[PDB]
Amino acid sequence: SAICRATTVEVTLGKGTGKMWGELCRPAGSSPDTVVTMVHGATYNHNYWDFPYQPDKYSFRKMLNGAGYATFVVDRLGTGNSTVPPSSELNLTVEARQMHEVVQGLRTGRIGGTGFGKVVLAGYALGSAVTSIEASTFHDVDAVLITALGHYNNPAGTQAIIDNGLSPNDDPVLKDRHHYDDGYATTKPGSRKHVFYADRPMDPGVLATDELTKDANVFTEAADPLVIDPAVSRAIDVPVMFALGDRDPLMCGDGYEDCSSQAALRAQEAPFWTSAPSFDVILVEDAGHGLNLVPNTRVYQDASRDWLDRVVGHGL
Ligand SMILES: COC(=O)c1nc(-c2ccc3c(n2)C(=O)C(N)=C(OC)C3=O)c(N)c(-c2cccc(OC)c2O)c1C
Structure with missing residues (x-):
């Protein structure tokens, strides 16, 4: 019971233009004013935010639709169904301009038809950096959800x-799709377990699904x-939720990101979010780097949801 229409968006790419793939979903029998736009992280694609194994538990998109919100999960250019240009043409600032265009298009109705009143940007990992730059440059989003960065x-x-x-030309999962140039990368088979998830307890089906839906x-x-x-x-200058796993192998450690407690994390990050009228922080216990894909992810989902309800609401 959720209506989902896959679509493509004309997006700026040096001269112009390139295709960004995205899926817009609305709760069945409902037309919300708020859409949550979900930008995935590096080596992942849209599946991170709409994970296909046990989606009732692990799909963040679905949780959102069940909360009443519209959602727009995307494939960043270079990944999945989106255009895969030369690596030189792509960088964070270029990519943020692309995200600005997706927001822009969700507000006006170019994407989806109805046209949304409030837009939330959600970011995972380097998608959070894309998110931050977008929010900072254009100021066209009503709240920002920062995760894993x-x-x-x-x-x-x-x-x-x-x-x-x-290189993704040597990877069995990604070989057949494209001929990627020398500035595209991915991870080795069987490595994700350690490099992202820190070897923490996971469902075997989640790890297998992650390796089968990985990207360049x-x-x-x-x-x-x-x-x-x-x-x-x-x-x-808008409300920001900052989410982080306490065993994240890319952030956490002594003399680095302080993952010893939620209050400590909050303390250490606050000097970086001073224009935000509210700065909220969730720290996910026994969790690695992919927050949507851990066994106690529902704690993280509920908090994110409760925050949305608090700072934007899903409209009418
Ligand atoms: C899923 O997580 C990521 O998006 C991610 N990937 C990676 C990542 C993913 C793939 C690759 C690399 N990095 C990389 O450095 C490299 N040389 C590659 O080539 C093999 C990668 O494929 C990150 N390094 C980082 C990163 C982490 C902490 C600080 C940073 O900068 C100040 C970060 O950029 C992130 C956040």
């Missing part, structure tokens, strides 16, 4: 990704200084 980080976590990297990415975007720039996040 902190201002401090762990070099060794990042290095493990580099030590488990390979443009790996220069990870080294971008904009990912951790304080100037970007400090400029955000």
